[PDB]
Amino acid sequence: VSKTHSFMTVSLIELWERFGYYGMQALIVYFMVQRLGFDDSRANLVWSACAALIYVSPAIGGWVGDKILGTKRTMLLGAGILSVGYALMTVPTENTWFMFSALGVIVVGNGLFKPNAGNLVRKIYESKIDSAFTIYYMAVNVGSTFSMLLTPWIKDYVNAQYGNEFGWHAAFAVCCVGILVGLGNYALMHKSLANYGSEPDTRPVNKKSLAIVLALAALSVVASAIILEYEDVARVFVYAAGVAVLGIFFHLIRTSERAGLIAALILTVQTVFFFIFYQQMSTSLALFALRNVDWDFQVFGTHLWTWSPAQFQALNPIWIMVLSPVLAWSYSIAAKFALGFAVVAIGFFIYGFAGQFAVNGKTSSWVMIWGYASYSLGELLVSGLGLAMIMGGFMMGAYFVASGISQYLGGVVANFASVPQDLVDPLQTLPVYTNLFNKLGVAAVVCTIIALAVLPLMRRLT
Amino acid sequence: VSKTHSFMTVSLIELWERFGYYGMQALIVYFMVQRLGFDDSRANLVWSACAALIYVSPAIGGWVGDKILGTKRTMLLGAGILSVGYALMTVPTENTWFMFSALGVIVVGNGLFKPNAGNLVRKIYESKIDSAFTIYYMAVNVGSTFSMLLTPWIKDYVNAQYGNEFGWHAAFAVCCVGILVGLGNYALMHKSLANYGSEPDTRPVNKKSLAIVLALAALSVVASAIILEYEDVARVFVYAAGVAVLGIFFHLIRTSERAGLIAALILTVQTVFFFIFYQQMSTSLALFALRNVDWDFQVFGTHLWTWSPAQFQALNPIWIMVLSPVLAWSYSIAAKFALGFAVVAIGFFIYGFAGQFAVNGKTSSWVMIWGYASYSLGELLVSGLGLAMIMGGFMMGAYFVASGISQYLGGVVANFASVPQDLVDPLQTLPVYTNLFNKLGVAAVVCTIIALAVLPLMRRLT
Amino acid sequence: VSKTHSFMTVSLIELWERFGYYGMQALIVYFMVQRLGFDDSRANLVWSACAALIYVSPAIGGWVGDKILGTKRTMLLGAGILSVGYALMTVPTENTWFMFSALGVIVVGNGLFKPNAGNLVRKIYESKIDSAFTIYYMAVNVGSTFSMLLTPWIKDYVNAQYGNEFGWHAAFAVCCVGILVGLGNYALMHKSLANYGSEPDTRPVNKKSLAIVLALAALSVVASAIILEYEDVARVFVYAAGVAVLGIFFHLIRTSERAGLIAALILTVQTVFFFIFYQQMSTSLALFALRNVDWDFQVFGTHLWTWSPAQFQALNPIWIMVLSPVLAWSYSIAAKFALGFAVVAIGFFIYGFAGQFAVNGKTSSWVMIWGYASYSLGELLVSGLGLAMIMGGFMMGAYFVASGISQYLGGVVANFASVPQDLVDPLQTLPVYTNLFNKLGVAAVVCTIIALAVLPLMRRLT
Amino acid sequence: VSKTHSFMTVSLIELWERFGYYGMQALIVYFMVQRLGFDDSRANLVWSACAALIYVSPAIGGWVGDKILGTKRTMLLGAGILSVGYALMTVPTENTWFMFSALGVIVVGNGLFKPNAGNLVRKIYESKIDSAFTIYYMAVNVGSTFSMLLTPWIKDYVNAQYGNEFGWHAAFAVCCVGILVGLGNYALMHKSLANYGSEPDTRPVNKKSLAIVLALAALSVVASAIILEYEDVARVFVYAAGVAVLGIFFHLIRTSERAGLIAALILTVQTVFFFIFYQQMSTSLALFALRNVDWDFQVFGTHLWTWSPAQFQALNPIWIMVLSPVLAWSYSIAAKFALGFAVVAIGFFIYGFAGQFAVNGKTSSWVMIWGYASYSLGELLVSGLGLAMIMGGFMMGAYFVASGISQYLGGVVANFASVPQDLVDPLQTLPVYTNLFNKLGVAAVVCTIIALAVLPLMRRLT
């Protein structure tokens, strides 16, 4: 019909699928602690190891749909794998297979979707696509905001009303229909994109091609599955990649004429220094949100509402929507890069800094609201790196696999919070929580220096 | 005679008529509490419901004088209705008809004046009329400053000197001669504008036209009158408008080709989010100025003067005159819009924040002087909206009637201060005043996000 | 010889004559309190009334030397009247004629000099004379700095060594040779300016002209003298000027076509609002520096040096030399004017604000160092007014005589510090000093509004 | 081979030789206090007097290598004199000849190197050599950072493990192989610079020239040696220079047509005002780091690592690498010069300011980390002076010799910390340390005024 009339049907199906994902990534780390009876140091590792599967997952979906099936059926097929992916999550037992089962089932379902969203959006224009994409990114951001503000309040509503543990699984179902919502938001308008097809679905489909794809999906389903039964295999797949991915450049650091490669490695070794700090909010900060912070969010002197145990992790698409034409105040190179590490640094100092004050037995209620603004403030302006530094065929995935490796090592950082499950009084939990955030932040200042230390070398080579 | 010699005779008659209005809007809310014996929750509603009549009132006067009588006689006729409008106010009884009588009598007297002031000023130029209007607006602002700084000090001077309640009515008479002043400021110079007539008073007047106008005025006088005898009718006129005014766009949100209409609704639904916060200074803050704040305005350690109970509401044309070429510091789109909500937000936090400290029995004397600067700081730069976004015949008044509806809902916000009239000790009043301003301000931060959440959508459509 | 070689001989003779003047204006107010046995309220008035003679005094010298004798002999004759002007000051008795005698003897000696300095400097160029004058002004400022930092330390050195009161007169002699220094700094180089003569001393001198000039000087000497014997005559000369100088514009406010005159009066009535606040540092602050401030200038915790009782008034050519290419940070109308009043305002609040804290019996040692920076910060950028707004013959002196009238009214402001001379314990002096500086500063904020209140009227008329 | 391929072999040999030097200038002042049994006031003077030899030392090496031997062999010969220069330092006795011996042996070894580094770098370009040099300067700065962070931790590792004093000499050997490292970093690549020779080593070498050079070196070795045996000779060589170097301009202040010379002296007398404040970090602050500061670097509440007694002096190439494209924020004359003195001033106030608080017996652990940032903040932007103000043959070294004289007078400033070696309890050391840093800083503000006091004179003469 029209350009902008075409634009919603990929915006809105993203707006609902993205709404599905964050309901998982909200409580599932905080889930497997007090209900099941996991220790916690086992439990930190799981989503830790899970996340590395997920950032590398746009590569596979970057391979499949643009080359085999066509984008649109891959945009179709990437949908309702999450339909199993939470209906399997919500069957109310406690047998610990289903839990670790469907987590990897998400991955190809995530994978066949995320570089299949914007890739067609990149071809309804043919370049001020930011004027198209900043609809979409702030369509993600309006969409992702609706998510975790809601998706544990359902979990709050149940488990002192219906009687037993029939509620943790219930809130999982909220995103389950939410992806089924995103079906019908497409299904009732799936004629709009008909003039903007990819390149295989110009021609009709191939079941000779399709059966292998779902088989290699079903290969990858079980491949992503067999991890969390005895976590040592997660190490062994990294130490074959994590040696050979530094070896990816060993073919062309000093052997290969144009040393922008190692300067792209200079960005790359800097890039891994990001994501190691991120995963703490999905890990230890969630444990920090369990047995220290009071849930009596009192402004000044009055009384307000008790928080969730974990809608803290919903604050993150507030600030990347607030501080996001603010950080588009242009007039009023990758080192804007750097000083954001110091934001992450001064982020971390705060968390002992209130526990410095208000020992009450417990911590101090507030704290977090300026915490999450810090990490977001560097998070906005630093993507596009080797995707900014635009002979390719290895240069493509070289940034990707290490990025997932960078995603992995947050768990092996965060392990020091392992209070034994016998220590009950949180007068003695805080002194082991204070000994981790500061010395994480001490070296977090030291990170700032290292980009600056080689900083004037870049201005010449460009 | 001359252009600038013509310019005073509309400036000065505005400068005196505007001087009349604020004497009413100063104490009349604080009037009907401790003298009559109203509760207070009845009393908040009255000026609350009165104000909605007044912002819609330039529309009717925008219809009458430019089309029927001519501007000048409408500029004449809009004057001395206030002459009854305060001489009726000042007759010293306590029978509660006169009070609610003349309040609506103001309205057409206000109505036939405010878009008849500047409309001729718009035609002594034929466009840097801001270089004409910023005389006028700061002629309003020099004029409006003289007002409420004075108009309750008269009320102070009486009621412990002359003996009884013969003083509340006395200060009302100060503006009564003040409008009679504005007669003679015109009447001794009413030959100057003779070359700048409208379009009916090019021709001679029509009593065949005039008698209906004053009849429809006298219709509207009683129509505006019959409200405050049993306040439920004020609801019922809103719920016929407030449904049909959202229905005004229902003819042309999704039916009507050019979606700037709903983006003008995006400004509009944002616009209503303003005025709901305004009316608190004309309502609850005045009650907050009665039985908490000490009147011992002590700078640092010395002694100064006891305040009025309500010249606080005079501070508002100070700051919109101070901060008003400051906010014309240009080089050193409607989202400048937005962050002013955060000013209104951080405005409100202060009021418990001093009561947080100086519990003395009572509150803490100071407080307010930085309070009123906040609301003004957003108030300067946000008008001109659909009057900035310039097929019209419904688009005109659609912003207006909802704006008065937006004016209305402040009273149904502010009702929570209803202390029963038996509770005397203000040690127990403050804990019910602290429970309202914070959670008004809590969501006042939440307002800031919502313009930002859809903010990048505007830059494309223009 | 050369341009710049000519430039010193008027720079340096200014640099020494200006060095002479400030030695007087340093302690002479603080002189006539504890030695003689004056009360203090008599003593405040004297330099108060003296100062008004002095700012009007460039007008008379603006008349004499450029028209009668020639600049150079008037530059000569304006010198060593101060030679009597301090040798008369230093004769060691206590008879109170000499004191009030030579104060007015300064005036014509000041008068025949200050507009005779730069007027020739204006004609060694024939216009980037600021590149000439900012040598000179910062030659004044390097010169004036050497002054009062030294000229009471001599007074410190004597009066507990030589035995009696033979020292107050001694420090007066320091500037006495200092003007005799400025003789020889000219006298050993008085051939340099020989090619840059005025216009009478092109021709030879006239004793027929000269004898009247010194007679009218000797008329003006006794005329300036007969003031301080019974101070009521000082009123009566103002109330003939101060009525007729407002009457100077009464010929041409509303009678005289071009209303920049009253806008120049708008600057003028604003201009008088300056100087009323200035004279406090030459008056009450000096009394505030007598019997409150401890002289134990302790940085942090150690020990430093005891101050003078009055080198505080030497701080003022420090800051107008520090903050003076700072305030020439241009890119990184007279309302820059205005906000400097708020600097003067926030200046004054400090003085009770430390006495708020450190009641020790006495005040708090520090205080002043940020005080004097405030008054200077507005003092730099506000001269040149009607001398900026460039049919003249009355427009010239109209700003001048009111400026001296503005100089006068500081004394009738500062009178409220009149502690009776019997009250010894400074525990009870501070509560009458706190009651004056705040309410001076309360209205000092109110001054800021008044320029802003008419501020947009100026941008049109220019 | 290539330009940038040539660029390392002078970068890296600088990067290792500079790495050698700072290992000495780190602990050698703190060395001769508690081990040997020196008082301290003798010990301050030694490196104090040593430093003056070192800044003048680029002049001699600016004479030798570019004119006699050729740069490259002078770049060769300037290396391994430090090889003796620390192997002599490390022979484990306590006879106090070796200590004062090899300190001057450094000097010609430093001298034949520092203007022989960049001088060839100035001729691999032939002018955006800053785009070459900011590699090098931040190659110095990446190199110099590796230094003192490490070179007393070796000294920590020994002297409570191996038993006795066999460790102070051990850490000296760390730089000894480090210069031997810088041999092989050249020696394994000494064919790269072969096309970029100086001008003597175009031709073959001369042993008829060489033997005098090493003899005049061996003259200068003993000449620099005979100082510290009885320190009065160090005075007598200054008072022959320090009179005649002010006499260097006495030939051409007022005798010599172009007064930029004295304005270059205006920079010069300002320039000496720098370096007097510097040497305190190499002197008294090191003593301040001995017997006041606790070594329990506790962030907030936890526990971290005990410091060194002197890696504080390693902080200085952190900040001049952090704050060094920050201070290259250009758009967002020598008076940028000036306000950095106020940074040095507000630097010094801090050191009593924490001892003001946390008297514990001892001082307060933290303190220093914001201290060293201050001195660096002026240190970046102020070099290049008479090397910026570009008839030479005396104008060259005139800035140099006074700069070393300026280097000298820090020791005669810092002498006031001479606690007698008997006073043990550091409750009584701090009150003599507080009495020095403040009144050093009191006049440090006074320095700021003096450039400003003559500041507008410069803008005309250029």
Author numbering:
A (entry chain B), B (entry chain D), C (entry chain C), D (entry chain A): 8 to 133, 137 to 266, 270 to 345, 356 to 413, 421 to 492
The authors write:
Proton-dependent oligopeptide transporters (POTs) belong to the major facilitator superfamily (MFS) and transport short-chain peptides from the extracellular environment into the target cell. Previously reported structures revealed that the bacterial POTs possess 14 helices, of which H1–H6 and H7–H12 constitute the typical MFS fold and the residual two helices, HA and HB, are inserted between H6 and H7. PepTSo2 from Shewanella oneidensis is a unique POT transporter that has been reported to assemble as a 200 kDa tetramer in the detergent-solubilized form. In this study, a combination of X-ray crystallographic and single-particle cryo-EM analyses revealed the species-specific tetramer formation mechanism of PepTSo2, in which the two asparagine residues in H12 and the unpreserved ECL play key roles.
Tetramer formation was confirmed by a single-particle analysis using cryo-EM and was further analyzed by X-ray crystallographic analyses using lipidic cubic phase (LCP) crystallization. The difference in the lipids used for reconstruction in this study might affect the physical properties of the specimen under solution conditions and thus cause the preferred specimen-orientation problem. To alleviate the orientation bias, we tried to collect data by tilting the grid from 30° to 50°, which drastically improved the data quality. However, the atomic-level oligomerization mechanism remained unclear because of the resolution limit.
